[PDB]
Amino acid sequence: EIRWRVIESISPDGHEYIYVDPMQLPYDSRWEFPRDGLVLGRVLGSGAFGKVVEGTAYGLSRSQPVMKVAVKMLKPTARSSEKQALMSELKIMTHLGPHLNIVNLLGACTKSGPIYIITEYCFYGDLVNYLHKNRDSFLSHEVKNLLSDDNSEGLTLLDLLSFTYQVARGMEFLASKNCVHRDLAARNVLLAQGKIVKICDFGLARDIMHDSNYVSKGSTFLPVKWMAPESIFDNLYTTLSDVWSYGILLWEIFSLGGTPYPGMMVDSTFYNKIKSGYRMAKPDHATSEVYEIMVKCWNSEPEKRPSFYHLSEIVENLLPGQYKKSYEKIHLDFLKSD
Ligand SMILES: CCN(CC)CCNC(=O)c1c(C)[nH]c(/C=C2\C(=O)Nc3ccc(F)cc32)c1C
Numbered sequence: 001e002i003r004w005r006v007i008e009s010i011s012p013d014g015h016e017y018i019y020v021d022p023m024q025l026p027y028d029s030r031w032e033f034p035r036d037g038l039v040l041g042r043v044l045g046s047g048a049f050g051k052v053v054e055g056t057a058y059g060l061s062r063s064q065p066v067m068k069v070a071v072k073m074l075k076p077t078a079r080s081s082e083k084q085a086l087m088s089e090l091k092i093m094t095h096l097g098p099h100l101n102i103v104n105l106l107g108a109c110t111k112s113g114p115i116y117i118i119t120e121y122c123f124y125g126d127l128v129n130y131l132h133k134n135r136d137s138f139l140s141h142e143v144k145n146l147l148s149d150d151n152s153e154g155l156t157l158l159d160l161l162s163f164t165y166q167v168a169r170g171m172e173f174l175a176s177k178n179c180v181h182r183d184l185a186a187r188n189v190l191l192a193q194g195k196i197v198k199i200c201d202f203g204l205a206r207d208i209m210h211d212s213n214y215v216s217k218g219s220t221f222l223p224v225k226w227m228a229p230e231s232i233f234d235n236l237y238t239t240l241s242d243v244w245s246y247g248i249l250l251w252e253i254f255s256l257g258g259t260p261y262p263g264m265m266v267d268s269t270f271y272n273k274i275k276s277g278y279r280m281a282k283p284d285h286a287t288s289e290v291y292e293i294m295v296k297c298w299n300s301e302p303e304k305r306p307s308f309y310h311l312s313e314i315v316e317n318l319l320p321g322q323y324k325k326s327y328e329k330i331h332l333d334f335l336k337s338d
């Protein structure tokens with residue numbers, strides 16, 4: 001099963017959303033890539049129903065003819081409905097199109113054997129792991145030119161703001177396609193060479209059962225600490241509830257990978273506190289301004305939360321003018337790729 005959902009229509013009220021169904025959408029066979037060409041490496045992440053594997057693609061890209069990529073595939077056991085869910089994920093990726101700040105679809109092997117989804121390889125791994133690895137090196141404080149490069153220096157507040165801006169940009173693209181993530185968290189944000197953040201669903205390769213954050217509910221498991229109240233209590237997911245998750249994500253970022261609501265376990269009294277209006281306090285490294293962003297995203301009234309487009313502007317003003325220049329260039333280069 002896949003978490004991602006694209007909105008097709010809303011009732012006039014509108015208390016009823018209608019989500020596109022992937023199986024309805026057509027798989028463009030242009031994406032097909034010969035299996036022999038692909039080479040499979042060590043497994044990036046393994047879970048209950050499949051895994052993501054590092055790999056190398058030859059001739060997949062005109063720009064880069066020898067490319068390193070991450071491949072998603074189902075386990076052999078391969079329950080038939082799961083096989084459709086992977087095609088579904090593939091169709092959704094095709095429908096959304098590409099963006100700099102998502103893990104992008106590159107190709108697929110669907111014709112003769114297990115289905116393979118080829119995707120961008122993110123050299124630095126998940127954001128949460130990366131923050132933990134660079135925790136001790138953190139100092140607050142031509143620094144701007146280095147930010148969107150692989151050059152080696154201590155993690156700084158500019159980096160954290162760069163991650164913040166890019167995730168917002170990523171959401172805007174997603175929001176702009178009426179796509180609701182429903183599992184936005186630092187564990188679902190990967191980092192690519194050049195320090196480009198890429199939002200993605202880890203779901204098929206990750207196992208929820210082993211992961212501590214997910215809490216059981218009606219035969220499913222929910223990222224409760226990242227969920228807006230309407231998602232918790234009323235089971236409604238919108239772009240506005242993703243904005244809530246984004247605020248929690250910023251807390252993760254500016255606490256250098258801390259667990260949200262530290263010391264608080266998800267129980268009867270937790271739900272009462274979220275319903276009470278409890279919000280987290282400012283994390284240690286959060287600038288006064290960023291915390292204001294977190295608070296705005298945590299508004300109890302969903303329509304009062306800022307739009308993802310709006311957030312990008314707010315973060316852009318917390319960053320030097322040269323950074324936006326550097327991002328626009330990398331934006332164009334990415335679009336010209338291949
Ligand atoms: C750094 C230590 N890590 C274990 C804690 C192992 C190192 N590497 C890692 O974690 C790692 C890296 C470097 N990439 C991934 C996963 C993906 C990746 O890169 N692109 C993707 C695209 C799609 C996808 F679904 C997963 C990945 C991991 C888990």
Ligand SMILES: [Cl-]
Nearest residue numbers: 099169172173
């Ligand atoms: Cl855009």
Ligand SMILES: [Cl-]
Nearest residue numbers: 327328329331
């Ligand atoms: Cl731009």
